[PDB]
Design a protein around this ligand. Structure first.
Ligand SMILES: [Cl-]
Ligand SMILES: [Cl-]
Ligand SMILES: [Cl-]
Ligand SMILES: [Cl-]
Ligand SMILES: [Cl-]
Ligand SMILES: [Cl-]
Ligand SMILES: [Zn+2]
Ligand SMILES: [Zn+2]
Ligand SMILES: [Zn+2]
Ligand SMILES: [Zn+2]
Ligand SMILES: [Zn+2]
Ligand SMILES: [Zn+2]
Ligand SMILES: [Zn+2]
Ligand SMILES: [Zn+2]
Ligand SMILES: [Zn+2]
Ligand SMILES: [Zn+2]
Ligand SMILES: [Zn+2]
Ligand SMILES: [Zn+2]
Ligand SMILES: [Zn+2]
Ligand SMILES: [Zn+2]
Ligand SMILES: [Zn+2]
Ligand SMILES: [Zn+2]
Ligand SMILES: [Zn+2]
Ligand SMILES: [Zn+2]
Ligand SMILES: [Zn+2]
Ligand SMILES: [Zn+2]
Lengths: 202, 203, 202, 202, 202, 203
């Protein structure tokens, strides 16, 4: 075979993949009880009642299908949208009908620096009949304020993917793009973190 | 083989490919009598007397070589330029020396929606010795005003390529690309742009 | 095999590759005595005493490892930084401990025009344990003022790479990115040449 | 994109693809009323009552699912097996429950010669959850007796695939395998044609 | 990214990869105390005193470097060679200097059938400066006697790789070769199993 | 980019590539005055008067087109055939109309060993409209008598390609291919084969 900085995830039912969710067009991940994060350009395409699916892997199944109950955009310029779902599944996952028993939120990392290895996990290919999760690895190029840039292979559906460090702790949320190219994430500054904690379902 | 969102067009002498023309560096397509559409960043590299070729495919031939007679940039910000050609071919196509007999313009689509399948058809590799036409498929991500964004594999030479729906109706013109399933950016034909184009079709 | 607009350089100890240097995260190239060029977003990550390596190729060796002695960013908008190194190698090259005897600066080309063939030569993959030099070919799309655009396969590490014409003369410096994509360089205008000549070590 | 001697067939419900059928592990194609052809190493894995599907394409549907009613191996050395199916579909195709109304047999070509372009049409990837038909093009290298050799990209599932000329006429049946490799088929000699005609369901 | 039936193994220090060993040219795996298996065409290239390395992964290290003490070829036609190593490492692994503490032998599977998923694990690229383990997945095509055939992407260095089922139990040893091609293994018949058990170091 | 054991040769007008010739379906290489070597399964598709081309590279030109004048198969089992050409080019190369002035034969290597790096140089894609020369690198797996096996990416058209060591000396002729790092099979030049070739070089 060959070196490859992106590979298909064959088992999406183990951590960290159990923190990731699919939209028809994009990716999101869990941040707290009944609460997911994605980009604003993703959430504009959705409304209350639309469905997300928890860590799906084509016909190997998933953690359940859930409906969106609230969409809250961050008021700053950063591309962050908090989405709450109804806790009771439309279709159950293997751990039952409760959203939170089928998913796992991430710990925030202590920080991030140029040169460290990150992973972007998400559903790179939008509007497919089957959901396939890919893991894209690469180094951090820069952390400046609320901007984190890394070199990786990312595609349009990665919008909303978590960016994790080597210990599966959260360093960012992807928003825009062999391919070892600069790719762009929102780094969680204290003001963004505060907006998120405030909009987690209580 | 493998899934691939871009493949070589092996017969460019059937519809929809007989709508598409090649520049040395880019793509365009036919909009009406003696008239083609491309981007402003393409037309700035050309002038009256420069040559375009109709639906070429390496040494399989083409629908003729024609000279440019007029360049008319759209006055708005969108990246659209109208180019008229001399009707009399420099080199004939199989349907003769008249440009219009060797090409086919597209019908406009009724609109376009996020999630629908499009195709971008054009000459993705600029400044080659042989013209090779590729078809790039993918879903529309967004339509907002004159901006249409789709996820596809497009390349530098695709500047000017038509963006068609599943029934080969026109939804846009490609202008920028900034596996590969990447957001790619077209001009959606709003009424103001359609009016400009209609007014600049050779009479 | 297949047509490919980017291939691995297997001997980096011949011209023009002997004008190219590696940073941990990016590329640069020699402009004069003890002096290299790169981008401003590359030099931001380095400081006096950090190290660059002269035309490395995996474990086939290199022209030596050298320390940075001064960093001078171009005052204009263009993404150009001049870096001077200590002349005395930290680790020697095959031609000895003097930086200048192990490298080769480029001649400026007379100019550059749309459609001509260029090559971008550099270390495309950032933060690797081994330095691998690739050569990316493609045509110039546009030259205007200080902006040169070409169609090529470039990646995040190519920041700082020379852009040469078919006679290995210098037409620009890469700064931003099959793939036949528009890629962007700084074209050396008289004002930029003047800044560079003024900042070559004496 | 790139030159490629193998591409996915996106509509398998037009000629010539309507002459091709799938087994779980391999390909076959229609030779006459209720009758298909494949290799002897394919038919070894099947029995009466096993199922084949007519020109499937993922979830875009198919020409119907049919049961095997008889397996007849060619007495000679050549890797040819005739399989008859029950005429009445287990699951219908768009043209109804009759096998014959949903498929199309091929005309034999007048012959075949070195350098002419052929196509091998079949299901290259064995034992998949979804059937994906690919078309592999390439030139004939040699024809001798019952042996036709061509240069193409074929894979293990292509056992049993038709080999057609540029007018979709039949020149052989694949049996054994960028990749532009010599690939091997059975050329239909008069003795083989005679066996086949004798074993077409009446 | 894309579907791929072969991927780089990033951590070779967990089971099942801790059963695999590298030769300069090929692969082998552990069958018992101080004892490995490979092909006869591999062992002909080695002699007492030559080195094998336990589950290496470029510069991430390995389970130790060990010397060959005995080579015993199976007397039948099948491509099987038992190699014993000196128990005391030339260079230790993380579990110390004893060969057997750094490696793990496999359980034989109860049998194997057409259509089941297998994995071939080994070092596909011979005579490299760094050892990179790849995992190639695919279905079993046939089990006939001492022959097992599967559809996979295998390369010259895979000679000697174990072929494992989905529970990491042993089904074969690879000996000869997108690429989904038939690939050929020795299936462990009782007579082969007896030869192996008889030549395990006591 | 990526590691790749096969790449396109961009200048076929330098050594070692000026040793290699193209058939419509296969490769060969020069062994001496007016004489080339290929496989028996290639030469059986050719006859006196058929044309080979010297070191072509698409439209960059070539060292001339020459006609075959004699085919002499090796009497042993190994897959070797000697082909002589008419010395006077049908179409000249840059060094003129004489075949020998436009090509270069190889020196034989002193031998070959498992683990050493070789190159297979040839025209891997048969029956194309344009001749494209590729170089496939990889290690020797085994040498036994007249059999040399190496791990490389070779294709149908590589039949007849020379197999050279790191100093461009001849170690073998490729005959069969049965990423891709696969065992590939050449004829190693034993003394009996060398003698046959020397005796069949045009005088
Ligand atoms: Cl980039
Ligand atoms: Cl993108
Ligand atoms: Cl582009
Ligand atoms: Cl082959
Ligand atoms: Cl195969
Ligand atoms: Cl192999
Ligand atoms: Zn490989
Ligand atoms: Zn956005
Ligand atoms: Zn690439
Ligand atoms: Zn395939
Ligand atoms: Zn523009
Ligand atoms: Zn990709
Ligand atoms: Zn090839
Ligand atoms: Zn910058
Ligand atoms: Zn591509
Ligand atoms: Zn790409
Ligand atoms: Zn392309
Ligand atoms: Zn068979
Ligand atoms: Zn290949
Ligand atoms: Zn392959
Ligand atoms: Zn992808
Ligand atoms: Zn063997
Ligand atoms: Zn393939
Ligand atoms: Zn690369
Ligand atoms: Zn032969
Ligand atoms: Zn491969």
């Amino acid at each position: 075979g060959s070196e490859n900085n992106v590979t298909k995830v064959k088992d999406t039912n183990i951590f960290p993949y159990t923190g990731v969710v699919a939209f028809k067009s994009a990716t999101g991940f869990v941040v707290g009880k009944n609460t997911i994060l994605t980009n604003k350009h993703v959430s504009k395409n959705y409304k209350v009642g639309d469905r997300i699916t928890a860590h799906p892997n084509s016909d190997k199944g998933n953690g359940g299908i859930y409906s969106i109950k609230k969409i809250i955009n961050y008021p700053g310029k950063e591309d962050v949208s908090v989405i709450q779902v109804e806790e009771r599944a439309i279709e159950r996952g293997p751990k039952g009908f409760n959203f939170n028993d089928n998913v796992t939120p991430f710990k925030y990392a202590a920080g991030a620096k140029a040169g460290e290895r990150i992973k972007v996990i998400g559903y790179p290919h939008p509007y497919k009949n089957k959901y396939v999760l890919y893991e894209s690895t690469g180094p951090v190029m820069s952390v400046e304020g609320s901007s984190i840039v890394y070199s990786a292979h990312t595609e349009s559906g990665n919008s909303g993917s978590p960016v994790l460090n080597s210990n599966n702790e959260l360093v960012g949320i992807h928003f825009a793009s062999d391919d070892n190219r600069n790719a762009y994430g929102v780094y969680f500054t204290p003001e963004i973190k505060k907006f998120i904690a405030e909009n987690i379902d209580k």
